[PDB]
Symmetry: C2
């Protein structure tokens, strides 16, 4: 049930509207090799989106320019130059990699760590929600955006349904969720010793439908991931690697496509999402046993519809919440503190 | 006043004397990068000393031998980061880390600054029948047979601590450094060298034509000790300030800007509290010419006190360190990259 997760997300994006377009300049240095595509992707990310609500952002790719923040995680030659901008450095990557606090003053990541003002946890799933929120500011979408909220203020598109018929049909109670294939699987890397032992074991209850390169079954890689996952009862949602707190956009795609995620990745995922809403493979002593609970859910429609209908988020006294209250306000406070703090924390020899 | 610091240290070293039990074998590998003197230092560290109270340790450097833990500093064994440098841990490479950073990473990180290891060493050196500082009878550090040489090696220190001399009746400020890659420390030195001359007993800015043999005896001869860390790190408080307290001299400190969390600010000059060096020096001048204020500072407890008890920040103790390692040994998780 995506709608309540989206509602919670939209509320977490609630902040005071800034008055009369006087957003102070913020100069951010980013990867020098980024081309116009990567730049476009960055101007579309939730971090940029959030910051644009309070600053007039300029991006810098010239190494001989001063900046307010140097952003990212350069490697090789570009990591050396970083050492010299001795600018206010902020570590940020989509990879399962913890920050180097000798080189970076501040960091935004997935680790469950407290370093006072120097670190903020902003999992990748928050950014995927931002993209799902934008894609449904469409007049044909089956998910609704609170009137007048930040995501509803830009003009809406009209392509969603044409692009996600099946998804719309089932979200719109015009199809029966029980009347679907067993499970979808979309992945690009074959080497995943833990994932395969699991695909082989899931793929031996009923065939698993593959839409990506690994274990493909359709004979072609699916065009729209979300439309494809909505055609199955479950979605094989294993992260590429394990990290405590490392919850990617994958589980969000399952929720969004109205299918039950079968999750494995961060052993603490239950902190971020309601475990009654997905098969948390970590809540079992072995796969063997988890395969059995999936086998059960697949043949006991009541338990299956129970899970599909749980709020993706945990609740405390009826109010749904993001773990540690992640929100636009929390993220903007973190940046206002970084910008106003003149202390140099990185190695400055 | 080192005595109260030692008392709190000895108390922090108190552990249950499980005797019905026996220390189980614990196999510890050290990385190859580690030189023989880095291995000798480790064998002599307070961490090794603490662990040896609950485990029968075997330390080796054979990467072919299955071990319970492996210690390094930049396999499928649990790796523990441990270094003396002002270097934050790489958690991609190490499952666990012992450091100085003010960080909380649940069971993966433990703060144990080098000053705690320097206290361990001073405590041993004072298990000596001619020593000016006392160790509670029946404490861990008093169990071994003592030495009889302390006074001989530190006459002046015993005199002042033994009240056979007057604290005010001494030189101005000592400075013992041998590292030159420390610009801020030099600039502060040249600036302090103004109130009066600052006697230099080490390589760097050496005064008396030679290097002193006993750092502590020497420091006990001055009213203050110029106590600068080589670089700034939040939480990076080394052995230096402990040498000042041990030598019954006022530390003039710079290094960790959060040093007041670890030590009682009324007990030393914290250069970080001033907007510029000039202002810090003005304060030093004042202490040097106001006997009541100087003595007050010299007699303060080096540690902060709360609820009637002197304490180490965040309750650093043998028990805290033993629980951290017990948790590592019992947890099968491997966090490092593979």
């Amino acid at each position: 049930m995506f709608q309540p997760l989206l509602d919670a997300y939209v509320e977490s994006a609630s902040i005071e509207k800034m008055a009369s377009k006087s957003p102070p300049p913020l100069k951010i240095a980013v990867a020098n090799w980024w081309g116009d595509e990567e730049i476009k992707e960055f101007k579309n990310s939730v971090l940029y989106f959030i910051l644009s609500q309070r600053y007039t952002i300029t991006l810098h790719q010239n190494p001989n320019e001063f900046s307010d923040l140097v952003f990212g995680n350069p490697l090789g030659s570009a990591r050396k130059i970083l050492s010299y901008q001795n600018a206010k450095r902020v570590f940020y990557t989509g990879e399962n990699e913890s920050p180097n606090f000798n080189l970076f003053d501040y960091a935004i990541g997935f680790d469950e760590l407290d370093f006072n003002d120097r670190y903020l946890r902003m999992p990748l799933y928050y950014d995927r929600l931002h993209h799902k929120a934008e894609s449904v500011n469409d007049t044909t979408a089956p998910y609704k955006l609170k009137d007048n909220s930040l995501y509803a203020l830009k003009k809406p598109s009209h392509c969603f349904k044409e692009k996600h018929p099946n998804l719309c049909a089932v979200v719109n109670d015009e199809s029966d969720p029980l009347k679907r294939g067993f499970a979808s699987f979309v992945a690009s890397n074959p080497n995943a010793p833990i994932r395969n032992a699991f695909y082989d074991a899931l793929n031996s209850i009923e065939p698993v439908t593959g839409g990506g390169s690994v274990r493909n079954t359709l004979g072609y890689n699916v065009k729209n991931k979300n439309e494809f996952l909505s055609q199955y009862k479950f979605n094989l949602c294993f992260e590429n690697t394990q990290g405590y707190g490392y919850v990617t956009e994958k589980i969000i795609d399952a929720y969004f496509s109205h299918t039950i995620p079968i999750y494995w990745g961060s052993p603490s995922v239950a902190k971020d999402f309601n475990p009654k809403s997905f098969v948390n493979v970590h809540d079992f002593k072995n796969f063997d046993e988890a395969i059995d609970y999936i086998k059960y859910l697949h043949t006991h429609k009541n338990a299956y519809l129970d899970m599909l209908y749980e709020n993706p988020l945990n609740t405390l006294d009826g109010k749904a919440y993001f773990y540690q209250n992640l929100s636009f306000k929390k993220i903007l406070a973190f940046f206002k503190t970084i910008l106003e703090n003149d202390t140099i924390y990185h190695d400055n020899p």
